[PDB]
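Ligand-bound model needed. manganese (II) ion.
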Amino acid sequence: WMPAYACQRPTPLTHHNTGLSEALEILAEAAGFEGSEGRLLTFCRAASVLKALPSPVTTLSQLQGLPHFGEHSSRVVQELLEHGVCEEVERVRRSERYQTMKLFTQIFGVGVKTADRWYREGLRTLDDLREQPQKLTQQQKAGLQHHQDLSTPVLRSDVDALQQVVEEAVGQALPGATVTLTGGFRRGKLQGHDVDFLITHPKEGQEAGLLPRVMCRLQDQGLILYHQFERSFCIFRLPQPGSWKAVRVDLVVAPVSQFPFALLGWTGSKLFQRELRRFSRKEKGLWLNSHGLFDPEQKTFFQAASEEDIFRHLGLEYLPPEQRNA
DNA sequence: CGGCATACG
DNA sequence: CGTAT
DNA sequence: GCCG
Ligand SMILES: [Mn+2]
Ligand SMILES: [Mn+2]
Ligand SMILES: [Mn+2]
Ligand SMILES: [Mn+2]
Ligand SMILES: [Mn+2]
Ligand SMILES: [Mn+2]
Ligand SMILES: [Mn+2]
Ligand code: NA
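Prediction:
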């Protein structure tokens, strides 16, 4: 009926159970804030199952037989179906712990562990953090300074402009190098939190050394508000009407031999890639990452020329990016 | 009961 | 520890 | 939290 792994089923960007999945993703997020990766995963997977359904869930019986729905996620849905709200979800929403961990972890440079420590120290607001900047990393100082712009959704119109400037710098750093839009925008999102790009070159090995050359050129054009190799987590200065705004941009380089694996990995979703790697290992005995796919019996790597190759080597029906919105 | 994706900066 | 999908 |  409904397969158990998210990589076994199309998941479109918009769907027929938005309210139910949003509620389960609250509980998933809260689990993460408490360090319960297992519960986070189950709530994420249950949410994604609903995203993959062809019509709205209207009755509790429609959950029977759906993978990843047990006592807890079913009770959440039952309450939403009966009352329009789930008391547990609402308790989380308005809890000081949830609101503060959400606020802190959304800072670039701050993870659950840092947020939790700050919470235990009594800190609650961004200005609480600004008062004692001696305890911040440079990365967190950047995330905090730019927090307001970074909280503003990036639009598809912003993306085309950014891509043009990235290509200009990439073309100077290495003629022939290519830039591919990845992440959520490649899955069809109309807005996002950041922009993800994958860079390669058709001649294996020519991409070596490329990212520092790209970064130096962007920085010389005055476009880099912050940066820290093959992955660069930047804050770009993006022109705006009569001004500009800070935007998070990720630049990644891969040799062309690895490009299909890095495209697949950086196109996501996060849950899709976790499920795909889990499927690969547990069902097929193969080890998948954004560099390659390894058979640990033969001790060999699978050559891929396309994402389609990778799906085929895993025995999965091909899913375009717009159906990977798990 | 063990497992829960797998990297890089 | 942070970051990424 | 759920699965196999
Ligand atoms: Mn429970
Ligand atoms: Mn009731
Ligand atoms: Mn992204
Ligand atoms: Mn990103
Ligand atoms: Mn590498
Ligand atoms: Mn256990
Ligand atoms: Mn993301
Ligand atoms: Na963060």
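Residues 108-111, 113-114, 137, 139-140, 182-184, 194, 196, 228, 231, 233, 250, 252, 264-274, 290 of chain A lie near DNA strand C (CB under 10 Å from a C1').
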